[PDB]
Amino acid sequence: XCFXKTCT
Amino acid sequence: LSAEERAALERSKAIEKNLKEDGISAAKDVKLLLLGADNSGKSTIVKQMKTGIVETHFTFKNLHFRLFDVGGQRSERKKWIHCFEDVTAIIFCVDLSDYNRMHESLMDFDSICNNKFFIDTSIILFLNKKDLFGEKIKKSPLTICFPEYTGPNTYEDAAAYIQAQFESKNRSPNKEIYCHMTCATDTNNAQVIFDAVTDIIIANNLRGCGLY
Amino acid sequence: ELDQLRQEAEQLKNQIRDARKACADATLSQITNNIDPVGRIQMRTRRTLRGHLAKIYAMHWGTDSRLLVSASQDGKLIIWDSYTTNKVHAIPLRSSWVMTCAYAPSGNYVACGGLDNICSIYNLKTREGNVRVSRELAGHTGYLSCCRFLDDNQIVTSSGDTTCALWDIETGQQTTTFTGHTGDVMSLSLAPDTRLFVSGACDASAKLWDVREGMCRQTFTGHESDINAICFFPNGNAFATGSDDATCRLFDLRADQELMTYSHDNIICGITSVSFSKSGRLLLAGYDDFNCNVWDALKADRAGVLAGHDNRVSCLGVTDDGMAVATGSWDSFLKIWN
Amino acid sequence: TSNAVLTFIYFVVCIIGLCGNTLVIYVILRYAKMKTITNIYILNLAIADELFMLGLPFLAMQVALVHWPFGKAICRVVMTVDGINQFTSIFCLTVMSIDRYLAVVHPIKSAKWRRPRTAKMITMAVWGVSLLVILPIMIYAGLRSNQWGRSSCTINWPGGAWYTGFIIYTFILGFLVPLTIICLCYLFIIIKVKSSGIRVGSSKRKKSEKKVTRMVSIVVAVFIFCWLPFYIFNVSSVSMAISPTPALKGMFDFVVVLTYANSCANPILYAFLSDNFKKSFQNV
Amino acid sequence: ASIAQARKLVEQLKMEANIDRIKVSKAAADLMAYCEAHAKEDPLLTPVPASENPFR
Amino acid sequence: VQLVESGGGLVQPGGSRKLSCSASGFAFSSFGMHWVRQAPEKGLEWVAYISSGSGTIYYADTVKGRFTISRDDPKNTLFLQMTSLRSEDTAMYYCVRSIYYYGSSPFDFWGQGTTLTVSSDIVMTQATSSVPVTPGESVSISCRSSKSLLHSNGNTYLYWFLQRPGQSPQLLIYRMSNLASGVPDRFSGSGSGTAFTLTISRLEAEDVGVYYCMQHLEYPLTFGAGTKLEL
Incomplete structure (x- = not known):
């Protein structure tokens, strides 16, 4: 769940 | 803070605005120093594309060319060179009529190339006096002035040798002697200068942008 | 009789040198060794006059110590207001090659000149609000290097033809032509009495001339290079000269002896402008190494450093009351220091 | 483990960015005097990259420990400053390429527009544009619980249609505007340099052409190599769902490190390899 | 021509020679006394208060 | 240098008429100029001021909001626009030059003036x-x-x-x-x-x-x- 600059 | 000081500040701002506007209007001006020998070359170059320093101004392809002829003042050039330091290019004229003048003309050219003020200033060379030199070289070989010359008595190779001898005194990066040979009788001279001039600005802009 | 004339000239020169040596008995450095040394003269810029696009070649302080005239290669003669950093006048120049500028003692007129061989006199105070050139002085065959005002009607100008001249502005002609100088004269300084003026040239010679007499009286030699800047001592009995040989040297009129030589091993570049202070204690000279040095006149030690000018320091001046100094450099800035 | 090496490379690239940017800003402020517009451009680029580097290490804590070790307000602040620095750096590269194009290809037009006040105005303009374009991040920042079970900074709360919309807008802008314009500008610069009709038979022309071509190619290639993988991975994650995997998280962290490395490498390329800048630096 | 110029130069040298050069010590003492007398009149030697300074 | 003005005349109260002035042998673009009225039997009093380049425009509180001033440098002319005239505004109008720098001499020359008939500050x-x-x-x-x-x-x-x-x-x-x-x-x-x-x-x-x-x-x-x- 990667999104933006930080992957969740 | 008071009244007439406010008026004086307003006048100072108006003067600064006018001064900056005059300066920006001077950006589209090309300052071409002229340091040729005066035998027959200077007059034709001055008159075709047209006693203190003589300024000759002419417009060409949206550029204002200002030629500064310093000859005739008869003074020391060490006090002269530093004034003409911001010129874009130095036009030099060389007459092929007299062989004796060639040695001191070449020495002056070397001195101009080696000035600390002109270390990064490009030079546009003009080997004038074409037709008469071509007619005369057959009678007088290029040996008395240059005993080191070992080549056929031909116009083209002798001219190339002269050009190479002149440009051998560059001895400096970021500078190039743009060489051209004008007859001074019927020429398209200014256009050539324009092309040459353009390159310097581009080169300068490159060093301005750090791309070198 | 050419050989006899040369022998007589050599004998006269030898006699003059022997008389000068006999007159010399002690060194002024030894005489002033007793006085206390002047401390570190630290100075800071108080204003940075801005509005020159090209490089500055000359400046002159006004009589009121407020208005100063500065000349640059852009062709603009800007009269400054030192206190408020304003531009009282901006006079366009016919020729942008100007090397000298002068401000009249009364303040009504301003002089400029350079490679045009013409000294332009412009009247600031007119019925109209514009600044127009009062008179263009012509006749010199060389570039004008320096000019100073004697009155509102008399001006002295040193040109590149190894000569000086005195002009009557109203007449427009040459009343006096000071000749007999073998080097290109570059600077002249006027004594407070405005009767004797010293001109230094490219032959490493500084010649004293009398305004009324019109002929040279004394000659000072000894420099290893051309003389660029000259300035009378405040009393008018002495002066100093700056030269490309990287040192300043002081001369006295009555003694005819070179007194001290301000030379420093690190300093190697030439000299552009030099001037004394109010009392003559401090002698300011701006060099080509992007710096100005302030020498104690009697201690002969570099006591002040004036730095901040990116390019070569070209012109330097001291106010009439001597409280402020101005350094105009090739970086298109004039800096006022206190 | 992977987390340790990612944190180590994060710290290393942060240190490199700080040291390089401080060196460049120091040398400009101490010797360049910001006299010409070019020094203004490198100065503002160094300022942008400096704060981008300063925004880096807060992400390293998130990489090391999944939970955000800080508050929500500081999360919003760090995301906003990161957006500022990223977009103003890309816009600064754009405007520098535009300036070089003007100067080289159209020297007359260069003099027509080139001015120091123009440089300051355009710098403030690009900074304001960066603030305006990040404003969505400013107003929609926050923390989402991660798959591990911890909070992490995130930027799009209501929705995943807005995820795709925002990412499409972001990379479409950040490439179509900057990348295409810089490529076209440098291609035109090369064309103008080769368009000289003067023979210039000396090797100076060949050396100049080689230097210009290499300098253009290096910057374009590093920009592509550092920004493309991040956007393609992000758009692949947004468009198509993928199962959680430590390999994917490590790849994403590494590509973020890569774009930070591009930010670090921009000032070296734009200052350390400039002839006048090199002379000024080596002067002391 | 050359003879006239040589004679003029010789006459100028003779005229410059026929002057009374005072002792170096006396002139040096006069210069030192002049510098000492006007020490207070020069603001560069002695720092001026900010109130008296108009260039602040 | 000569300042010649016209436009003065008999004006009905509440009307509007413009006065003009032309300067000869004089530099206009660098001078701030003033309009000042004189009552027929009372003393002088200020009206308006136009700066150099029209940077600032100042009026008197008696005529604030009803009077305007305009300089036409290419036309080398100065205009005073008057409206809502009153019976108390009958006066002889003078236009004056004023140049502002260190040691200048403002108000040195006064125009002939034109007559007009109509049917806190430091004291x-x-x-x-x-x-x-x-x-x-x-x-x-x-x-x-x-x-x-x-x-x-x-x-x-x-x-x-x-x-x-x-x-x-x-x-x-x-x-x-x-x-x-x-x-x-x-x-x-x-x-x-x-x-x-x-x-x-x-x-x-x-x-x-x-x-x-x-x-x-x-x-x-x-x-x-x-x-x-x-x-």
């Missing part, structure tokens, strides 16, 4: 209405100011004016000490805040007139009451 107080004088005798004229006219720059702003009978006013002293161009050295001025003095040693013929104070410390240019000279 200038002159104690004496008029003084009978004789040739060869020194005469003193005094001005009083509500507020000190000395600024922190170091000079005091006050101007001296003479009203030649049947002629345009002339400038005598500016900034308390500097005489004007062409004035005799007999006139002199001095004083300090709230007490300002003018002296005419060895008075001669053609010196009769009314003497007016002026200030430049602040904009409203309230003039002196005036002191008539009687022969």
Whole structure:
């Protein structure tokens, strides 16, 4: 769940 | 803070605005120093594309060319060179009529190339006096002035040798002697200068942008 | 009789040198060794006059110590207001090659000149609000290097033809032509009495001339290079000269002896402008190494450093009351220091 | 483990960015005097990259420990400053390429527009544009619980249609505007340099052409190599769902490190390899 | 021509020679006394208060 | 240098008419110019001011919101736009030059003026209405100011004016000490805040007139009451 600059 | 000081500040701002506007209007001006020998070359170059320093101004392809002829003042050039330091290019004229003048003309050219003020200033060379030199070289070989010359008595190779001898005194990066040979009788001279001039600005802009 | 004339000239020169040596008995450095040394003269810029696009070649302080005239290669003669950093006048120049500028003692007129061989006199105070050139002085065959005002009607100008001249502005002609100088004269300084003026040239010679007499009286030699800047001592009995040989040297009129030589091993570049202070204690000279040095006149030690000018320091001046100094450099800035 | 090496490379690239940017800003402020517009451009680029580097290490804590070790307000602040620095750096590269194009290809037009006040105005303009374009991040920042079970900074709360919309807008802008314009500008610069009709038979022309071509190619290639993988991975994650995997998280962290490395490498390329800048630096 | 110029130069040298050069010590003492007398009149030697300074 | 003005005439109250002035042998673009009216029997009073390049435009509170001023430098002309005229605005109008730098001489030249007939500030107080004088005798004229006219720059702003009978006013002293161009050295001025003095040693013929104070410390240019000279 990667999104933006930080992957969740 | 008071009244007439406010008026004086307003006048100072108006003067600064006018001064900056005059300066920006001077950006589209090309300052071409002229340091040729005066035998027959200077007059034709001055008159075709047209006693203190003589300024000759002419417009060409949206550029204002200002030629500064310093000859005739008869003074020391060490006090002269530093004034003409911001010129874009130095036009030099060389007459092929007299062989004796060639040695001191070449020495002056070397001195101009080696000035600390002109270390990064490009030079546009003009080997004038074409037709008469071509007619005369057959009678007088290029040996008395240059005993080191070992080549056929031909116009083209002798001219190339002269050009190479002149440009051998560059001895400096970021500078190039743009060489051209004008007859001074019927020429398209200014256009050539324009092309040459353009390159310097581009080169300068490159060093301005750090791309070198 | 050419050989006899040369022998007589050599004998006269030898006699003059022997008389000068006999007159010399002690060194002024030894005489002033007793006085206390002047401390570190630290100075800071108080204003940075801005509005020159090209490089500055000359400046002159006004009589009121407020208005100063500065000349640059852009062709603009800007009269400054030192206190408020304003531009009282901006006079366009016919020729942008100007090397000298002068401000009249009364303040009504301003002089400029350079490679045009013409000294332009412009009247600031007119019925109209514009600044127009009062008179263009012509006749010199060389570039004008320096000019100073004697009155509102008399001006002295040193040109590149190894000569000086005195002009009557109203007449427009040459009343006096000071000749007999073998080097290109570059600077002249006027004594407070405005009767004797010293001109230094490219032959490493500084010649004293009398305004009324019109002929040279004394000659000072000894420099290893051309003389660029000259300035009378405040009393008018002495002066100093700056030269490309990287040192300043002081001369006295009555003694005819070179007194001290301000030379420093690190300093190697030439000299552009030099001037004394109010009392003559401090002698300011701006060099080509992007710096100005302030020498104690009697201690002969570099006591002040004036730095901040990116390019070569070209012109330097001291106010009439001597409280402020101005350094105009090739970086298109004039800096006022206190 | 992977987390340790990612944190180590994060710290290393942060240190490199700080040291390089401080060196460049120091040398400009101490010797360049910001006299010409070019020094203004490198100065503002160094300022942008400096704060981008300063925004880096807060992400390293998130990489090391999944939970955000800080508050929500500081999360919003760090995301906003990161957006500022990223977009103003890309816009600064754009405007520098535009300036070089003007100067080289159209020297007359260069003099027509080139001015120091123009440089300051355009710098403030690009900074304001960066603030305006990040404003969505400013107003929609926050923390989402991660798959591990911890909070992490995130930027799009209501929705995943807005995820795709925002990412499409972001990379479409950040490439179509900057990348295409810089490529076209440098291609035109090369064309103008080769368009000289003067023979210039000396090797100076060949050396100049080689230097210009290499300098253009290096910057374009590093920009592509550092920004493309991040956007393609992000758009692949947004468009198509993928199962959680430590390999994917490590790849994403590494590509973020890569774009930070591009930010670090921009000032070296734009200052350390400039002839006048090199002379000024080596002067002391 | 050359003879006239040589004679003029010789006459100028003779005229410059026929002057009374005072002792170096006396002139040096006069210069030192002049510098000492006007020490207070020069603001560069002695720092001026900010109130008296108009260039602040 | 000549300033010639026209447009003055009989105006119905509440109407509007423009006055114009042309200058010859004079540099117009660098001068700030003033319009000042004189009541038929009362003293001078300020109207309006246009700066150099029209950077600032100032009006008097009596005519604020009803009067405008405009300079046409290429046309070398000055326009005073008047509207909502009143019966109290009948006056002789004068246009004056004023150049502003260090040591300048503002208000040195006054125009002929045109007659117009219609169908807080710092107060200038002159104690004496008029003084009978004789040739060869020194005469003193005094001005009083509500507020000190000395600024922190170091000079005091006050101007001296003479009203030649049947002629345009002339400038005598500016900034308390500097005489004007062409004035005799007999006139002199001095004083300090709230007490300002003018002296005419060895008075001669053609010196009769009314003497007016002026200030430049602040904009409203309230003039002196005036002191008539009687022969």
